[PDB]
Design a protein around this ligand. Structure first.
Ligand SMILES: CC(=O)[C@H]1CC[C@H]2[C@@H]3CCC4=CC(=O)CC[C@]4(C)[C@H]3CC[C@]12C
Lengths: 12, 246
């Protein structure tokens, strides 16, 4: 899954 | 009275360093590679910032992804112009405290003409005497500056949220006579509209450098590679719509 999606989904 | 000014002040990212070894002889490969490494780490902070912009996380996550994929170049160019204004009175391009482009680096970059255009953007901040509060409102608006030709998944909510931040720019200008404030609003939104053509030309150069990455020895970090792949072809193919104020 995308790096951008990780950053959008994560806490912070 | 402005509703988002203290928010925008609090969520503004801190400055990112490039990590460039300024003792080395500059080449186009070293300079473009360093800008890409800086871009990657700015992007991490742009995502965190967008998530803290009220309403942004209430869009469908696919729309969030789309807007960041479209708007990172504009957000980052505009922020760089502001840094160049505040730190070097727009005489040079202040990409990072450790990566400042003078004329020599603009030439060696292989994107001299685009650097000149970015310096002219920076000069507009000087002539217009853009305040920090205006800058922050304008930068938030750049997340809302491009949409798909076919629209977003939640286009109605996007339209209303965009208008909320347009009204905020107007509220800030008035907070800081009505005739002069309407003219101020026109000046600042015309500046944002003018940025759209520069961003398109930067997207073209980005694509060309990405396609030629290996031959040029210009490395693109992983998330920049991902985001360029996701939307820059679509941008160049006419599949997106800039939203102009004028
Ligand atoms: C390598 C490359 O193609 C160049 C063309 C335009 C450049 C960008 C131009 C705007 C910019 C300003 C920043 O402050 C971070 C780096 C970025 C985001 C640059 C990264 C590298 C880019 C994408």
């Amino acid at each position: 899954q995308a790096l951008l999606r990780y950053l959008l989904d994560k806490d912070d | 009275i402005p509703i988002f000014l203290s928010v925008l002040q609090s969520i503004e990212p801190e400055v990112v360093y490039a990590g460039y070894d300024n003792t080395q002889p500059d080449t186009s490969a070293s300079l473009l590679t360093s800008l890409n490494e800086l871009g990657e780490r700015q992007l991490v902070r742009v995502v965190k910032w967008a998530k803290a912009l009220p309403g942004f996380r209430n869009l469908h996550v696919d729309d969030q992804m789309t807007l960041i994929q479209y708007s990172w170049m504009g957000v980052m160019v505009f922020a760089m112009g502001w840094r160049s204004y505040k730190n070097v009175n727009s005489r040079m391009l202040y990409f990072a405290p450790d990566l400042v482009f003078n004329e020599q680096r603009m030439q060696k970059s292989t994107m001299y003409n685009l650097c000149v255009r970015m310096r002219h953007l920076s000069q507009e901040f000087v002539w217009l005497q853009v305040t920090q509060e205006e800058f922050l409102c304008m930068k938030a608006l750049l997340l809302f500056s491009i949409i798909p030709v076919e629209g977003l998944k939640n286009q109605k909510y996007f339209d209303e949220l965009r208008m909320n931040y347009i009204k905020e720019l107007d509220r800030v200008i008035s907070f800081q006579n009505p005739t002069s404030s309407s003219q101020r609003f026109y000046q600042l939104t015309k500046l944002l509209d003018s940025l759209q053509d520069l961003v398109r030309k930067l997207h073209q150069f980005t694509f060309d450098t990405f396609v030629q990455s290996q031959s040029l020895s210009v490395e693109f970090p992983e998330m920049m590679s991902e985001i360029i792949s996701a939307q820059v072809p679509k941008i160049l193919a006419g599949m997106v719509k800039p939203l102009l104020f004028h």
